Each structure stands twice: as structure tokens, then as C-alpha cells.
Amino acid sequence: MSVYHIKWIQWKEENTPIITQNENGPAPLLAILNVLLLAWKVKLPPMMEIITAEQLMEYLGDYMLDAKPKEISEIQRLNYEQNMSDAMAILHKLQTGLDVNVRFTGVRVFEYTPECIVFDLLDIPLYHGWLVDPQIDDIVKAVGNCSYNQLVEKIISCKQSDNSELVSEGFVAEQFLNNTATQLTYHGLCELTSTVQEGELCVFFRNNHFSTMTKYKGQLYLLVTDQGFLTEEKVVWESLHNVDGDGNFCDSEFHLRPPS
Amino acid sequence: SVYHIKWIQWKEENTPIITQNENGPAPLLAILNVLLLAWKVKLPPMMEIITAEQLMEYLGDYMLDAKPKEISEIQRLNYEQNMSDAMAILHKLQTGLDVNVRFTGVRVFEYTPECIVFDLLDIPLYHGWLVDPQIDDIVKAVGNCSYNQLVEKIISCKQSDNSELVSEGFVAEQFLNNTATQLTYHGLCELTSTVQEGELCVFFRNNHFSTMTKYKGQLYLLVTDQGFLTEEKVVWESLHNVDGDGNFCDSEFHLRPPS
Amino acid sequence: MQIFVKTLTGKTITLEVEPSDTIENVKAKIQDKEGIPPDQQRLIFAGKQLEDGRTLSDYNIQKESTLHLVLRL
């Protein structure tokens, strides 16, 4: 079906593989597995240069079963089995695109949809940085505790209202969605930097894309996974310190890459 | 004026920091706490209180002892003039220092004589009062204006007949109101990435000067209020939000448990 | 209007609801009786998951209907 090239890098002094992306779509599956690979909880044969989506799907599902939790009461086991079935049923969507419904009040705040179950069973934190600026009470009131799916419905309803307060609440909430279209705000960056733990491997949602995220020396980094950098041994991590996408490229030991 | 000294274990060495009571002397304490934590100025270890005259005598002694001996003729003359202008202003460090920020960068101030004191000591000066670039309405209204220019622009715009300028003043006024603690989340980001690891610098926020540093990527403010003088474990406060809800940490940047 | 919420184990609770109540609201009403945060709840009806922003009437949930609650760990 689809094949992905593998990049071998020096992660914590050990040869470690990461999956690389060409076409748009497979970011959810690759962000989850690149976490498992960087954590050495899923290991590949040392020679493999290229892998298809089927073995990645099987490697993942193989780990979900080996990651079965202990000390679970019968209530937890029943709720676990129902969650495990539904997550496996939608597991194929990982390679085509995963549906997310954020709320703009916290980096860990999503709607608990079945596509969140995959991250729960693997204990992989899922983050976003799409946060409302709390110093602007206009937006805080207009957006409230709405999810994205609710806010677009509120804008449509407000845009045709006769209440002068409601038309302004929708206009402000519309202004917010357009100004923050890359799905990352500076308040999100500040909350992410202080929420993600040092050394934590997690998944990051931003601009309709999933990235593997970690924190080193207090700085957030995103795993470089585009095949344009497949031969660049010195381009492994990209720093996340602005909403402009102007990050610093770093090698596998988080050292700055010299311009060459 | 007398200031209480707080002795802390800073980098495993007995180090003193000067501690503030009344409002006013924060410029002088921010500069000297940078110099004390940097072990560029050392105080006899028996001292418990210190007057302003001694503090500035230690300051003035350091500025003269830190003169660049190998400098061109163009550097000597300009240093000479900057030095003279800085001393005539030095007394203001004990009563309050006037700054004029711009909102486009953490290092961006108007180059007033109050800035020379920091240049002569190689002490960076920071603020976090930055516009959110994602809002083009505010970026246009605030522009490259300093604070002093912006309030005047708000004064003038409210009496204009040009509808665009009236709206520009309204947005600029809203920005100054929303961001009244003089810290924004864009500023907090830029500071966290601009301040280097272990850097000792001065931070301007809410008409106050703090001694700032970064440890493992997190920004901290030296706790200099006399209320925490006898709190051995309250040495640094983390800077990770605009609400003032920081975490108190000991001199090794470890979280102080409730007690 | 009263609907039932049944766990996988089989425990049934009654809620006083309105056809216009969102399922966020009924999740909060489950929190009032059972203590689970809404973001730790999963509600299923007619074999499909209900979305937080929809109402009971959007899914045609009528009186004396039974929702299925699934927990997360």
C-alpha cells in the first residue's frame, strides 16, 4: 500500500530508528510510533531501510497488547476491553488522518473521542497549543469553554443574530480563529513549555499535523520527520520557540546545526 | 536607607543578596544582586545590614575597576562621556529608574541615560511587554511606538476626525489596559528563548526591576522582599504565567514544599 | 424527561434531562450523581458515540432511553 523510509539516528548514544513522512496523511501513525521507537519500547531489525504501513500497524497493535495494564479490577478490565476494541476499529485512520476537537483553555484539553483512546492505552500524552489569551476578556468571554466544533457553530449562529452582544461575540470568536489559524498561540507555547516534563516523549497537534515532541534543557523540540531531511544526519530535532515556524534545526544530541 | 542582607547557598558558595523593604530601590538592588550572585562584588561575610552609600560605593568601585584597558580612542572618549552621564544619574537607582519600552522585543528600550548603567556593567536589561503578532490590528496601532509615544498617540487619536486613527487609538488603549502588568505571553516566550542558561540579568515588569535568571530552560526571579528574609527555602520564584502565581524555590531551584 | 445511563457492568442511574440538553450537560449531571469528570466519560447510544456539543434531540434520544457509559483509565 504505502512505504515509509526509515532514518537511523544516535538517540541517547544508541542507534535508534525514526519513521519519515513523504505524502500528507500518515502523521498520526508516525507520531505515535516515533514515540515508541525513541522510547525503545518498539525495536526494529538493525538493517531495515524502508517499511510499509502494514508492519507499522502490526508493530503498534502488537505493543498495545503487550502494554496491557496490571492491577485492574473487573470494572477497569471491562472498560478497557471496550476501549481496546473501539481503538483497534479506528486504528486504520492513523495513516489517513485523525480527527481532533480541541478546547482552547488548556494544552491537554480535548474532547474525549474514540481517537483519543489510542493515546490512553499507550500512555502517550497528546498536546496542542491553541490557547486563548486570558488578558483579552473579549475573547475569553466569546470563546468560553467551547471546543472548536462548538465555536464554529457559535460563529454561524451569532453571525445572523439580532442581539448586538451576540453578533460581537461571534465576530470576536471569528477573529480569533482567523488570527490563530496555524493552531498555535504564544500562550500555548508558554503552557506547553511549563507542562511537558523534561525528557517526556509525547504527541503534538498543530496546523492539522501531528508531531513527536520532547523537552530537553527546558526547550521544546519537534522530531523532524519529512523525507526532505532523510539524508541530513545533523537535522533531527527542530526547536519550537515561536509561531512563525522559524525553528532552529538540531542534531540528535540537541546541538545547533551549522549552516552548510 | 539601610538594607537587610540575606545569605544564601548559591552554587555551593555563601553568597549575599540585598533585600528590599519600601518601594524605590529596586534598580540599585537588581544591579547589585546581579553583581553579587556573579561573585563580581563580594561582601565581608559578617555583614547583616548595609546602607545605600556603601552599596553605590561598591558599585562605583566596580565600574572603575572594570574599565576596558585595551580600547581604541573612539571607545575611550565615548566610554568617558557615558561614564560621566551615568554617575550624575546613579543616585536615581536608589529612588526609581525611568524606562521607556517598545513593544517589539524583549531587549528594546529607548536609549535613555538610565540604560547606560547597565551597558557599563555588561548587564542585560529585559522586559516582556510585547504585542501579540497574530493580531494585525494591534501591530498596526502599536507599531514601533515606545510607551511614551503610544500614550501620546492615544491622546491625539481620541480627538481626530480620521475614523481610522480614532480606531487605532482605541485599540492601542485596549492593549495598554489588557496588558497592564507589563507582561504578555509573547513576551514570556521570547524571554524564555532569549535569556541564556545561567544568565544573570535585570527584568523590568510592572514598574519594578528584578534580578532574573534561567535554570534548565525555566526563568526565575530572585526573591528580594524583606518578608522572605528568614525563609531559607524561598530564594527564587518561577516565571511561567502573567498572574503572578509563581512557584517558590530554594537556592538550588528546588520547589519549596508548603510549611 | 428521564433517561437511564447504564455502565458496562450493568449499573443503571436515572437523570432528569430535557431534549435540548447537550451531552456535556448530561455528562455533568452524571458527575453530580457518580463523580466522574465529563472528560473521563464516554456515552454511547444506538451503537454510536455521542458528541459533546450535540443535544439529546439531535440523536433522537426519547424518554426512558438508555445510554451506555464507558470509562477511561
Place this chain on the structure above:
Amino acid sequence: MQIFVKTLTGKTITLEVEPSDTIENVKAKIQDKEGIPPDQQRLIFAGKQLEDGRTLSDYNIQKESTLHLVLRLRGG
């Protein structure tokens, strides 16, 4: 009959449908004109989200009615 679908991209699309058309077939017609996959689409009418199992009659969607097309956030 002919109905309008308003997007957040700033455009209003015209659709040729019939009252017996399932919501899925409406979304498939949107896929043919705007390339959006059906499961990513959310159609809003009367402040209600048109669910997939229903047809246009169940929401009393008559001719020249305007639906609103909002997308789910799909990471890829």
C-alpha cells in the same frame, strides 16, 4: 431540487439533491465539488448537525435552503 452550502472558506456552493437523499450522499456530492472527504464534513442547518443516518426530509430541508459546511480538524 437545488440547495446552497455555505463554507467557512468564504464560498457558497450549489447542490442538486432530492428530499430522499441521505446525508452521506449529500456529503459525497460535496466531495465531488470541493474534494473534502465525507467523514471530515459537518453540515449545519437550523443550528442542528445533520446526522449521517438521516435524509434531507427528516430535517425538513426544502428547496433553496442553505446548509453550513464546517470541517473537523484532521491532523495529517
Place this chain on the structure above:
Amino acid sequence: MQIFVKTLTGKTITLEVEPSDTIENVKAKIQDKEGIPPDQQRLIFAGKQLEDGRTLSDYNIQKESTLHLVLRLR
């Protein structure tokens, strides 16, 4: 009884079995068609892992039900 074994990639195969068969015999019959080593086979039903020594009747697997196949790769 008619059972279906589907992998995550999408390949669903129909197999003929009896309720009294054990899971070992279930993965041995899956090996008879696809040719997959049985110890590299993990079988799931209703989100529950199937033990080698239990039977289809112990898990109450009914007619026209789908079992999930996960391959234990190297």
C-alpha cells in the same frame, strides 16, 4: 459456525470452525489458509486477548462474528 478473522491492514478471511474448538486450533486453522506461523499469531475478540487453552464457547463467540488478528513481528 462461520467466523471471520480480519487484520488491521484490512485483510478479512472467513473460516469454518466449531464452538468447541480451542484457540490453538483456531490459529492452526488460520495458518492452514494464510500460512502464518501460529505462535506469531495474536487473536482478539471484543477487545479481549484469547488464551491458547480456552475454547470459542468460553468466550461466547457467536455465528457471523469477527475475530481480530495481530501478527507478532520480529
Place this chain on the structure above:
Amino acid sequence: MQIFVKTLTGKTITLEVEPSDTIENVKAKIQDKEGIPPDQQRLIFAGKQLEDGRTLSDYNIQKESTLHLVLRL
């Protein structure tokens, strides 16, 4: 608006205030809930002491801001 004050023991006090409130007034509102006299209270925001003669607006105290409370000597 409402603001919070936090003590070193970990207790968090919620106060209702107005920007025109003097610091002496907010210390009197603290006394109403805890019993500490304003003569024994020291209030800090962002590392700077809040002097009893100034107002909340003088220190730009926004709603939901956290102040630190210590006893003085």
C-alpha cells in the same frame, strides 16, 4: 473582580476587590477572612511589595492575580 492571595503554608484566600481599593483596604478584607491584622500583613505581587497607601490600580493588579502574603517584623 476577584483576586487570590497565597500564604507560605499553602493556603489560598479568595478576595473580592475593586481596582480603586487601597492596599490597606485589601489587607482589611484579608483580616475579615483570616483574622490577621493589617499591621502584621505584608502583601507582595511579582516580587514587589504592595504599599498600604497605594491602590490596586496603582500596581496594575488584574483580576485573578495571585498575591503573596507574609507576616512582617
Place this chain on the structure above:
Amino acid sequence: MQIFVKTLTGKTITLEVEPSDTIENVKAKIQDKEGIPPDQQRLIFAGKQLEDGRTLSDYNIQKESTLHLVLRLRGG
């Protein structure tokens, strides 16, 4: 004469002055009511900053005129 001084917070201060008081003296009257140091005070009228050596009449300031008081950012 009686003039008004408006702050950025909206407060309006009434001052009893004359056309011949220096700007430094007007700032002293503001300090007596608001405690604000004169060196921290900046007065704006007709788009001009009032300099301490001049008088109110130098800037054509009339009776019942409104001056704008903006402050310098003073770190303390």
C-alpha cells in the same frame, strides 16, 4: 483659573491655578493630591508636552481646560 487634569485610568483632577504658574508648580499641585513625583509626571495639552520651565500661559492653556497626565514608566 480652574483647570482639569485627566489620567489614563479616567480620573479627572481639579486644580486651582493661575495663568502664570510654571509647569513645575502645576506638577507640585498634582503631587500634593496624588503623591506622584513631578519628575515622573508628563502633561499633554494640544499635542505638546509641557516643559517645566514654561508657564500655563506659554501653552495658551485656558480656564476649564483639560490637561492629560501620563506617567513615565518608573521601576521601583
Place this chain on the structure above:
Amino acid sequence: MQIFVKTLTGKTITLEVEPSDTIENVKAKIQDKEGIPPDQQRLIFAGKQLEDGRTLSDYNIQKESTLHLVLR
């Protein structure tokens, strides 16, 4: 609006674009300023490839954004 395109060599190209421009129209604007042909350009933003056929609007590309350029 203007956007920036940074290469692995550190060189930054400033481009004048519109949100309705396609990625091919962005690669051709790079060819008008830089010597690289569109057949050899690969464009990335925030880790995601900007695929030919899409617009800048499809990727929510804001003003003053930095795109990354690398060989195809």
C-alpha cells in the same frame, strides 16, 4: 503579504505571496528570485510538506511565516 523561505545553508529568501497562491506559484516565485527550478524544490512548514496543488491558505500560512526549502 510576505513570507520567508530558509534553506539548509542559512540563506533566507523573502517572497511576496497571497493566501490564494498555490504551492507551484510559490515555487515559481522562488525561481524568479533564486536559481532553483520548481522541479527541484520541496517546501516544508512546521514539519509538514506543502504539497503541489494546494494553496498557502490550505496550510494556514500566515504573514511573516518561515518556510523551509530543500532538494526534491
Place this chain on the structure above:
Amino acid sequence: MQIFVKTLTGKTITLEVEPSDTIENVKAKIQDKEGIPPDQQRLIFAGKQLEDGRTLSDYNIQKESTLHLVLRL
């Protein structure tokens, strides 16, 4: 109007300015001529440093006046 700015080195620069020009525009003209960036400039007239937001006419800087430029390095 023509004014001169003089450095401590003694080099004198002639600038064509308007009275309504602010000091910020004057520093921008030295930026275009001598290459010194504005926030690394100090202009002095009559012994006082000139603020960026004020104008030449605010300091009574008229025809053939000499400014003093102190450099930042």
C-alpha cells in the same frame, strides 16, 4: 533647515531637517548617513539628552545648531 551633529571624535555631520521632525527621525537620518543605528545613539543639546518622541522645536533647536552625538558600544 540645516543643523550639525558633532561626535566626540570631532567629525561633524550636516543634516537637512524640519523643526517638526522628531529626534527619532533625526537619529534615522544619521542612520542613513553615518550608519549608526538609532538605539545606539545619544544626542545632546544644551547639556540635556534628547528624547526620541520629542521634536527639534520642543528643544528650541533652530538654524545652524550643533548637536552632540555620543555613541553606544
